[PDB]
Amino acid sequence: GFHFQQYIAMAGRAINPVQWTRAWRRMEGKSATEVYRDALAWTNNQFAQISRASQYRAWWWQNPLGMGLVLYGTYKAWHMIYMVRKQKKTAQLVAAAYGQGGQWLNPVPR
Amino acid sequence: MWRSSGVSFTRYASEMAALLRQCLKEPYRTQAMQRNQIHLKETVYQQGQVLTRETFNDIKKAFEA
Amino acid sequence: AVLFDLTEEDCYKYCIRQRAATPEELVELKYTKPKNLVSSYGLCFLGVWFGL
Amino acid sequence: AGVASLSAAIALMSVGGVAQGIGSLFAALVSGTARNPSIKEDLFTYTLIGMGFLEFLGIICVLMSAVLLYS
Amino acid sequence: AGVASLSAAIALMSVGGVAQGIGSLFAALVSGTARNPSIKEDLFTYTLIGMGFLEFLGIICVLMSAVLLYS
Amino acid sequence: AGVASLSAAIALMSVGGVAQGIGSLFAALVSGTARNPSIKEDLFTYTLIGMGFLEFLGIICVLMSAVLLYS
Amino acid sequence: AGVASLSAAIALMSVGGVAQGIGSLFAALVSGTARNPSIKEDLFTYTLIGMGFLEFLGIICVLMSAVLLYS
Amino acid sequence: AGVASLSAAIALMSVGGVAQGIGSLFAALVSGTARNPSIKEDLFTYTLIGMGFLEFLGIICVLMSAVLLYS
Amino acid sequence: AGVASLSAAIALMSVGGVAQGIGSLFAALVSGTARNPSIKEDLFTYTLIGMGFLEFLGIICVLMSAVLLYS
Amino acid sequence: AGVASLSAAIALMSVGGVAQGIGSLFAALVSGTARNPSIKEDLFTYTLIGMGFLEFLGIICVLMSAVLLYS
Amino acid sequence: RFYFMYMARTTFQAVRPLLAFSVFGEVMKLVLATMSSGLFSFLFSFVLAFEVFYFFLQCYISYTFLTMFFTVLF
């Protein structure tokens, strides 16, 4: 992993409506195949930078587990940001619709 | 702009009159840039003992140096 | 390029390849200020706000 | 449809003064730019600092207006 | 009985100050352009910023007038 | 219900402020043209630009007055 | 009823805001004429344009001062 | 609890009256920076002091508004 | 006595003229510090004298307000 | 029995003009001092005289208010 | 009366940062308690940063007024 700050900055630029107009203008004379190939090349460039530079270079976050810890932390951040938020929303929905624990209730006795 | 930029009104006026002369018509522009060439030789002193001597043929370098 | 009568482009590429051959040595770039700090702050606030 | 509406409307009388202040601010910015453009980035800065009060004050009044509309 | 109309008309009255501010702003623009005609884009930009703020305040007061009228 | 007249009349007070702004703007023109009578055009442009917004403000004030009148 | 007369007396309050606009415009005319008489008849024309608005913005309200008087 | 809201709305006028004065102060700061860019400090101190004074008046009136709204 | 609560607000409305005055004063102070800086020690002194008046007046505008809120 | 308090507040709602006048006084004092320090003793000599009227007016603006609070 | 004026000014300049830190903080806290979605929170982060800058401005102002009010010639 690397360039997390740059990834945040990319998302920040993407959410800017001015950058939406810039991309609209840049999209003149352009194909979906070209866009997909560009994105794939960018991702390959990232992973190739990793594959090459891990052989000789160590980041400030280097640790006895290497990139496993960075990838675990990425996963956990994604989890806590998205999935637990969704769980909160689903909990309030179920609690308003059936009550707490309504999805694990037993079938109605016959 | 000049008391802020550390520039004199005479310097500003001269450097703008230069442009106005550059915006002339060739028959009169010839006589204008003729009558407004430059040739000076500054000689700096400090209790005798000349510190430096320098020539000047341009208005901008004459005001700069 | 001037010593071997080659093109400065080719000599530049050769030099770059030979420096990449020894990439443990860091290279010196023009300093540029950071970018998108405000947007990054906003996204990181959103992150902590949903994640914690 | 009673006194709350009247109070929340009377609260809005300050927006005229706030708008006059903002106009004075940006008129001074324009004059300073036309005089000495070479300090634009300074004047704009100070203008923003001024807005950091004036705009905020207006927002205050608007909020208190709603507070008098739903007191 | 018609108190909402009174409240709306009382809230609308900030348009006077808004228009005074706009007039002062565009007067500064016109004067600065008569002085420095080579500098118009920056002055126009700052005038647009000020007009945006002032029109924001005006639309705020108009929206609150409509709210108090048709609550 | 004559009471609904009152609100409309109150709304008409804003027009005075609008007139003030218009006056100031045209004064800024009549001065600028004397300070720099060579152009006389780029100032009229900004004058008309501002008068657009001021006339819009006056028109919406009149419309709100008529609305609160009839309703 | 007689209450409408109050509405009329409120509708005549925009007058005396129009007067400041006329005063500012004609004062700018006077100053620009004293500075540069050479262009007198232009500034007069510009004032005739400004009064092309103000002379309406006054009498409009005066008409409202009648319409919300008799109705 | 109807008179308190109207009291607060009437007390809110000084906010708009105070925004004017802050506008003039920062306009003077801008003009001073335009006339003498060599002196940025020693103008912002006085500007901030005057802002503090007018802010104190604003805090006074807002405090009394909040007081009268519940007392 | 709700009108007491109104009276206090009215006694605070004068702040709209007060703060304006103070602003104008400090504006002039800044202009002086932008024109003849080497005599700040004079101008600030005079400004303080002015505040020694204006402050006092504002204090009255508070005090009487509170008195009309209690008595 | 709050009508006396209302009258006192209304009579007290004119100190803003005195304050604006005093601000203009001291602003002109500071301006003319930065323009010509050597003549300060006269600008002050007249300034105090102006205060000798303005403060007196303000004193009335208090006194009658107090009277209207009791009588 | 001058002593009362001076003490009023002094206490105001002393509590100015406390006000900027406490009551606008409470307002921000209300908004945080009420907001749920992500768009409003993204927009409110910038308001919070502005409040930070406003607090530091008020602190500078208080420093200025206190060095003005506690300077003695003799």
Residue F27 one-letter amino acid: A
CA distance D17 to D7: 18
Type and span of the H or E element at I12? helix I2-13
Q: Which residues of I touch H53 (CB under 8 A)?
A: 19, 22, 26, 51
CA distance J17 to J15: 5
Beta bridge partners of B40: B56
What is the total count of domains within chain B? 1
Other Cβ atoms within 10 Å of E10 Cβ, number? 25
| Strand blocks (E) in chain D | none
Q: Mutate which of F6, F12, F65 to disrupt the G interface (most G C-beta within 10 Å)?
A: F12
What is the total count of domains within chain F? 1
Residue D5 one-letter amino acid: S
C-alpha distance from K51 to closest chain D C-alpha (Å): 10
DSSP at F41: S
Compute the count of residue pairs across chains D and K with CB atoms less than 8 Å apart. Answer: 4
Inspect the interface and report whether the beta carbons of H32 and I28 lie closer than 8 Å: no
Given G3, G7, G17, which is nearest F16 (Cβ)?
G17
Cβ atoms of J25 and J49 within 8 Å: the answer is: no
Please report where in the chains the tokens 């280097």 appear, as a residue: A62
Cβ atoms of F31 and E28 within 8 Å: the answer is: no
Cβ atoms of D6 and E10 within 8 Å: the answer is: yes
Cβ atoms of F19 and G58 within 8 Å: the answer is: yes
Cβ atoms of D19 and D54 within 8 Å: the answer is: no
| K11 interface with C at CB cutoff 8 Å | no
CA distance F63 to G25: 27
DSSP at A108: P
| C26 interface with A at CB cutoff 8 Å | no
In order, the DSSP letters of H38-71 are T--TTTHHHHHHHHHHHHHHHHHHHHHHHHHHH-
CA distances from H27 to D44, H21, K57 (A): 11, 9, 19
Cβ atoms of G10 and F9 within 8 Å: the answer is: yes
Inspect the interface and report whether the beta carbons of H45 and K12 lie closer than 8 Å: no
Compute the count of residue pairs across chains D and H with CB atoms less than 8 Å apart. Answer: 132
CA distance I20 to H27: 13
For residue F35, give the chain E residue with the closest CA. Answer: E34
| F24 interface with G at CB cutoff 8 Å | yes
| A84 interface with C at CB cutoff 8 Å | yes
Breaks in chain I (C–N beyond 2.5 Å) sit after none
Alpha helices in J1-71 (DSSP H): 3-12, 15-35, 40-70
Cβ atoms of E10 and E64 within 8 Å: the answer is: no
CA distance H62 to H14: 9
> Which are the contacts of J25, defined by CB distance < 8 A and separation ≥ 6?
I50, J47, J50, J51, J54
CA distance E34 to C21: 63
Cα dihedral K21/K22/K24/K26 (nearest 10): 140
Which structure tokens are listed for F12? Answer: 């008409």
CA distance D8 to H8: 9
Cβ atoms of F1 and G18 within 8 Å: the answer is: no
J55 CB-side CA count, 13 A: 12
> Which are the contacts of K7, defined by CB distance < 8 A and separation ≥ 6?
none
Handedness of CA H66, H71, I5, I11 (dihedral sign): negative
C-alpha distance from G31 to closest chain F C-alpha (Å): 7
| A17 interface with C at CB cutoff 8 Å | no
CA distance H57 to H52: 9
Inspect the interface and report whether the beta carbons of K1 and I56 lie closer than 8 Å: yes
| F5 interface with E at CB cutoff 8 Å | no
C-alpha distance from K70 to closest chain H C-alpha (Å): 16
CA distance E56 to E50: 10
Given I33, I44, I65, which is nearest H43 (Cβ)?
I33
For residue B5, give the chain D residue with the closest CA. Answer: D38
CA distances from J29 to I18, I40, I41, K66 (A): 18, 13, 14, 27
CA distance B16 to B13: 5
| I16 interface with H at CB cutoff 8 Å | yes
| K68 interface with I at CB cutoff 8 Å | no
Resolution (A): 4.8
Q: How far apart are the first and last CA of chain I?
A: 10
Beta bridge partners of K30: none
Q: Which residues of C touch K49 (CB under 8 A)?
A: 41
Q: Which residues of C touch K42 (CB under 8 A)?
A: 42-43, 45-46
Inspect the interface and report whether the beta carbons of D8 and E7 lie closer than 8 Å: yes
Beta bridge partners of B41: B55
Cβ atoms of B50 and B43 within 8 Å: the answer is: yes
| C41 interface with K at CB cutoff 8 Å | yes
Cα dihedral A10/A11/A16/A20 (nearest 10): 80
Reference F57, options E17, G61, C24; nearest CA is: E17
Strands B40-44 and B52-56: antiparallel
DSSP at A83: I
Cβ atoms of I19 and I54 within 8 Å: the answer is: no
Residue F69 one-letter amino acid: L
> Which are the contacts of K65, defined by CB distance < 8 A and separation ≥ 6?
H49, H52, K9, K13
Which structure tokens are listed for D5? Answer: 């509406």
| Strand blocks (E) in C1-52 | none
Q: Does I have 3 or more CB contacts under 8 Å with H?
A: yes
Look up the domain containing E31 and give its range.
1-71
Q: Mutate which of I40, I48, I59, I60 to disrupt the K interface (most K C-beta within 10 Å)?
A: I59
With both helix axes pointing from N to C terminus, report the angle between I2-13 and H44-70 in degrees, rounded to the nearest 10: 170
CA distances from D2 to E1, E7, H23 (A): 9, 9, 35
Which structure tokens are listed for C2? Answer: 């001037």
Residue I52 one-letter amino acid: G
> Which are the contacts of K54, defined by CB distance < 8 A and separation ≥ 6?
D52, D56, K20, K24
C-alpha distance from I51 to closest chain H C-alpha (Å): 9
For residue K33, give the chain C residue with the closest CA. Answer: C49
Q: Which residues of I touch H11 (CB under 8 A)?
A: 8-9, 12-13
| E45 interface with F at CB cutoff 8 Å | no
| E37 interface with F at CB cutoff 8 Å | yes
CA distances from G34 to F31, F32, G20, G31, I19 (A): 11, 14, 21, 5, 36
- SS3 of B9-24: HHHHHHHHHHHHHHCC
CA distance D45 to D29: 10
Cβ atoms of F32 and G42 within 8 Å: the answer is: no
For residue D6, give the chain E residue with the closest CA. Answer: E7
CA distance J51 to I23: 18
Given G20, G32, G60, which is nearest F30 (Cβ)?
G32
Cβ atoms of I64 and J68 within 8 Å: the answer is: no
**Phi-psi bin for G16: left (phi > 0), alpha (psi -120 to 50), beta?**
left
Which structure tokens are listed for G20? Answer: 């400041």
Technique used to solve these coordinates: cryo-EM
For residue D9, give the chain H residue with the closest CA. Answer: H9
> Which are the contacts of G50, defined by CB distance < 8 A and separation ≥ 6?
F22, F23, F26, F30, G21, G25
